[PDB]
Structures are given as structure tokens and as C-alpha cells.
């Protein structure tokens, strides 16, 4: 079946809880595998210890820049960047998990969790999963964002891994 992975999140050192994500390996196997392996840290690098660096209320929460911590960095398990696999899944509503990018075919490790339907991103960002449990945690993260994307607390992925 499709992998289940988790992110445990703190804000200013206080635990917020766990977000559990289903990765749609049935539809986007290459994109799902990249995220799965970055969660386990099995290639020697990954998301553990990195931050949600850009959070915009009523839009999305963005994370995954584990090299530069500012939205310029990250890398995939395949190389620095990899192509857009497909655009089959859509940004249907809150809880969608999608790849951040710097234009066509520039996927690395940065990702976002939507807090609304972001249909204008369909065909531009590769959707590859959804939140199974922990939308309450995502809403807490959202509450620490701002229009500029700057967070009012330091939001850290303290642990992550694979459940099944
Ligand atoms: C129009 S701004 C460029 C798109 C933007 N990119 C980045 O935040 N960071 C650049 C980046 C660099 C390397 C990699 N691998 C991934 C992303 C991005 O992926 N996203 C995901 C949702 C939040 C943000 C975004 C998308 C569309 C419109 C606005 C925004 S944020 C104001």
C-alpha cells in the first residue's frame, strides 16, 4: 500500500503534535519515494531538525529547506532537482501535500501543506499526498504565520519517519 509518514512539530520548543501524511505512490511513485526517504533519513540527510520557514494564513505552510533554512535550498534523493512527474492529482482542499518549486522541473525537497483549496496551482505544483491525521496541528502552525510568510514562532520538525 501507500506509505504513511509522520512529522512531529514543535513551536519555540513546545510540542504541537504529530501530522500523519499518506503519500500517493500509486500515482506519483518517484515524488512519493523522495519524500518518504527524506522522512526516514535513510540516505544520510532529510527533514529532521528543519523548519517551516514560510507560513501564510488561509493559503499554506511551507517547509523542507534543510540546507539553507530560507526557501533557497534543499535537495532530492536523486540529485539537486528532479522533473515534474505528473499533474494528475489536484489541489482539492485543505490538507493537500504538494511540491514547492522555482518553476517547471525544479523539485527538490521543499513542500507545502495547503490550508485552503489552491486550485490556481493545479498544473504548476505536483500534488503527492494528503494529511490523514493532525489537521489541528496544521491549523496551529497556520496561526503562527503572517501575510509576508514570516513566522512568529520557530516551527521545527523535531522528528519524522515512516509508519507503514
Ligand atoms: C511564486 S514564488 C515561487 C513558488 C514558490 N517557491 C519557493 O517558495 N521557493 C523556491 C524554491 C527553490 C528551490 C526548490 N527546490 C523549491 C522552491 C513555491 O513553491 N510556493 C509553494 C506554495 C507557496 C509558494 C507560492 C506559490 C505560488 C504563489 C505564491 C507562493 S508564496 C508567496
Swiss-Prot record:
Mitochondrion found in the keyword field: yes
Enzyme Commission number, as recorded: 5.2.1.8
Transmembrane intervals: none
Modified residues (N6-succinyllysine): 24, 43, 132, 147
Catalytic reactions on record: [protein]-peptidylproline (omega=180) = [protein]-peptidylproline (omega=0)
Entry superkingdom: Eukaryota
Oligomeric form and interacting partners: Associates with the mitochondrial membrane ATP synthase F(1)F(0) ATP synthase; the association is increased by inorganic phosphate (Pi) and decreased by cyclosporin A (CsA). Interacts with ATP5F1B; ATP5PD and ATP5PO. Interacts with SLC25A3; the interaction is impaired by CsA. Interacts with BCL2; the interaction is impaired by CsA. Interacts with TP53; the association implicates preferentially tetrameric TP53, is induced by oxidative stress and is impaired by CsA. Interacts with C1QBP. Interacts with MCUR1.
One Gene Ontology cellular component: mitochondrial permeability transition pore complex
Location, primary (coarse class): mitochondrion
Modification N6-acetyllysine occurs at: 24, 124
Enzyme type, top EC level: isomerase
Protein name as annotated: Peptidyl-prolyl cis-trans isomerase F, mitochondrial
UniProt GO BP: apoptotic mitochondrial changes; cellular response to arsenic-containing substance; cellular response to calcium ion; cellular response to hydrogen peroxide; mitochondrial depolarization; mitochondrial outer membrane permeabilization involved in programmed cell death; necroptotic process; negative regulation of apoptotic process
Role of this protein: PPIase that catalyzes the cis-trans isomerization of proline imidic peptide bonds in oligopeptides and may therefore assist protein folding. Involved in regulation of the mitochondrial permeability transition pore (mPTP). It is proposed that its association with the mPTP is masking a binding site for inhibiting inorganic phosphate (Pi) and promotes the open probability of the mPTP leading to apoptosis or necrosis; the requirement of the PPIase activity for this function is debated. In cooperation with mitochondrial p53/TP53 is involved in activating oxidative stress-induced necrosis.
